A paper describes a structure:
Human anti-Phl p 7 antibodies recognize the timothy grass (Phleum pratense) pollen allergen Phl p 7. Here, we introduce the anti-IgD nanobody 072 (aδNb072), an orthosteric inhibitor of Phl p 7, for which we have determined the crystal structure in complex with the HAPPID1 Fab. Nanobodies (Nbs) are derived from heavy-chain-only antibodies in camelids, which, unlike classical antibodies, contain their antigenic recognition potential within a single VH domain (also termed VHH).
The crystal structure of the aδNb072/HAPPID1 Fab complex was solved at 2.1 Å resolution, providing a high-resolution view of the interaction between these two binding partners. The interface between aδNb072 and the HAPPID1 Fab buries a surface area of ~840 Å2, of which most (~58%) of the binding surface is with the VH domain. At the interface with the VH domain, CDR1 (aδNb072) contacts CDRH2 (Fab), CDR3 (aδNb072) packs against CDRH2 (Fab) and also forms extensive contacts with CDRH3 (Fab), while a minor contact is formed with CDRH1 (Fab). A notable feature of the interface is insertion of Thr102, Tyr105 and Asp117 (aδNb072, CDR3) in a depression created by CDRH1-3, which is bordered at one end by the VL domain. Moreover, the interface includes a salt bridge between Asp117 (aδNb072) and Arg50 (Fab, CDRH2). We observed that aδNb072 bound to the HAPPID1 Fab with low nanomolar affinity and also bound the HAPPIE1 Fab. aδNb072 did not bind to the HAPPID2 Fab.
Numbering used by the authors:
A (entry chain H): 1 to 225
B (entry chain N): 2 to 129
C (entry chain L): 1 to 217
Write the structure that this text describes.
């Protein structure tokens, strides 16, 4: 079916530029126009610009003052948005959408998943991951064991956590990410099913942080202190 | 900063004539069609006539066919709307609009969804 | 006006009806440009819900209808479902700006959902964290509804406010709310006190969990 898939999230220093891609599939790419819309936190959707996938001509929102440029590669079935001179108000999810013509105004019948662009002066830093546990590693009082991983000191958001019992993925509980007093972020991921006993290394939390190109695994909860 | 400036409006007697002009400026591309829309008091904007600048092809609404003549002068970036045998029902605010996507103009030359650049409009009154 | 105005939020009971107004101006709705409606569920891309004032594309149930008077549109939803929760945007084109416009969006909350007590687990500082000269108490709060919770910390029996960071609750993919509270301590604070406690209040009930430095031997 008609599908728009965009590149991943990006983080940028203020005054830099970012190039977001949007690959189209499931239909004739050059037979439909592609628009770009952004969504800032606590803001409405804001139209960014249009580009004809055939002849490549563009039309931009005057609110951006020449800072946004749109391009397309018909061989790759992909449109690109380049937003230069980034500022803090440019932190937003950038969608691409297909223009379906309608005599009383075009519609956006297919939307891409969006790409988060974060504009920050704070450094990018990989997370520290700590194995945390409730009920002690080897309970003597029949208490259930709860495993979780404390994920702290990273920037920017976000991190992705998965749990594994061997190679089998395991259900988890997700929690919000909060910005610490030191402008860094912290969060937690809890293994959903309580435990009793397990061989050392049976369970693990895998914490991916694309911004820092780092993936950290924790597969050992040491003898209880 | 695309601009579309209408001119030539005013007040005429039934059966009279008027020539409207739309001065275009700020275009970073030149494959665009120019349309003329009119909005009578308490109504919507309806397509009167349009012209593709490169193709030179014109279209007209049935209510104005024969009486109205749209012509382009790409050297001056101006599109003219010659209006003859004006009727009181022709009274409206006339707008000139540009179509940035040529595929839309080939499908619907006189539909609002075809034009994504718009001028401020000029008033035309035909008395009796 | 050269923009579309929607109410910030609209709430309704399941099986009941709700209406979302989207008012514009002469330069968009009044010029003849129609309204399009988009539905954006939590953590997903917007989806075309209604186009051309009152038309539904393939996949949209009859429970969604729309009207437009040329200056004010309306998206009505009959028989509210829990899955209807999300943000609903209207959209048009403005001739005075020569650009496409979107409404501010309306958050649809479906009331009457089944209430759920929070599942609270309090984690002491990990040995690894203590070896980094840092100590964080982790109070994980999951699987509750509605989202309002209050978290309070106690060292022994006395309240603690310094070093506390409590997340705003938010719905997770399980359609339940989750939250967290972190008590940042020095290793000396953690070892000196007899115990620390996380107190979670939620809809007329309070749950308290307690950890101690020597509870594991
Ligand atoms: Na693995």
């Amino acid at each position: 079916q008609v599908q728009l898939v965009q590149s991943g999230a990006e983080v940028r220093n203020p005054g830099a530029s970012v190039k977001v891609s949007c690959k189209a599939s499931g239909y004739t790419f050059t037979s439909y126009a592609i628009h770009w819309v952004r969504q800032a936190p606590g803001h409405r959707l804001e139209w960014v610009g249009r580009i004809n996938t055939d002849n490549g001509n563009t039309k931009y929102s005057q609110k951006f003052h020449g800072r946004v440029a749109l391009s397309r590669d018909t061989s790759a079935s992909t449109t690109y948005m380049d937003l230069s001179s980034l500022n803090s108000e440019d932190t937003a999810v950038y969608y691409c959408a297909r223009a379906f013509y309608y005599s009383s105004g075009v519609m956006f019948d297919s939307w891409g998943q969006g790409a988060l662009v974060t504009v920050s002066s704070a450094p990018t830093k990989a997370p520290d991951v700590f194995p945390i546990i409730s009920g002690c590693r080897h309970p003597k009082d029949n208490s259930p064991v709860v495993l979780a991983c404390l994920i702290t000191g990273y920037h920017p958001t976000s991190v992705t956590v998965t749990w594994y019992m061997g190679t089998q993925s395991q259900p988890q509980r997700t929690f919000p990410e909060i910005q610490r007093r030191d402008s860094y972020y912290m969060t937690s991921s809890q293994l959903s099913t309580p435990l009793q006993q397990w061989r050392q290394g049976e369970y693990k939390c895998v914490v991916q942080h694309t911004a820092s190109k780092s993936k950290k695994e924790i597969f050992r909860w040491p003898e209880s202190p | 900063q695309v601009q579309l400036q209408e001119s030539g409006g005013g007040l005429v007697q039934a059966g009279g004539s008027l020539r409207l002009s739309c001065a275009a400026s700020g275009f970073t591309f030149d494959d665009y069609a120019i349309g003329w829309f009119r909005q009578a008091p308490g109504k919507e904007r309806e397509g009167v006539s349009g012209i593709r600048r490169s193709d030179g092809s014109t279209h007209y609404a049935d209510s104005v066919k024969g009486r109205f003549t749209i012509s382009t002068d790409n050297a001056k970036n101006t599109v003219y709307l010659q209006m003859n045998n004006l009727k009181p029902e022709d009274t409206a605010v006339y707008y000139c609009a540009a179509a940035g996507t040529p595929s839309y103009y080939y499908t619907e030359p006189l539909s609002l969804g075809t034009y994504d650049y718009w001028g401020q409009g000029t008033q035309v009154t035909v008395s009796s | 006006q050269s923009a579309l105005t929607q109410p910030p939020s609209v709430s309704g009971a399941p099986g009941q009806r709700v209406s979302i107004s989207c008012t514009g101006g002469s330069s968009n709705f009044g010029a003849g440009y129609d309204v399009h409606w988009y539905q954006q569920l939590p953590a997903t891309a917007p989806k075309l819900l209604i186009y051309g004032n009152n038309n539904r594309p393939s996949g949209v149930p009859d429970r969604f209808s729309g009207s437009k008077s040329g200056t004010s549109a309306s998206l009505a939803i009959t028989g509210l479902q829990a899955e209807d929760e999300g943000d609903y945007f209207c959209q048009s084109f403005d001739t005075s700006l020569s650009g496409w416009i979107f409404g501010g969006g309306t958050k649809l909350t479906v009331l009457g959902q089944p209430k759920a007590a929070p599942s609270v687990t309090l984690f002491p500082p990990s040995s690894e964290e203590l070896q980094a000269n840092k100590a964080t108490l982790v109070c994980l709060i999951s699987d509750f509804y509605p989202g309002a919770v209050t978290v309070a910390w106690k060292a022994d029996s006395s309240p603690v406010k310094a070093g506390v960071e409590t997340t705003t609750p938010s719905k997770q993919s399980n359609n339940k709310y989750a939250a967290s509270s972190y008590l940042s301590l020095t290793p000396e604070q953690w070892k000196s006190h007899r115990s620390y406690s996380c107190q979670v209040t939620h809809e007329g009930s309070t749950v308290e969990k307690t950890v101690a430095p020597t509870e594991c031997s």
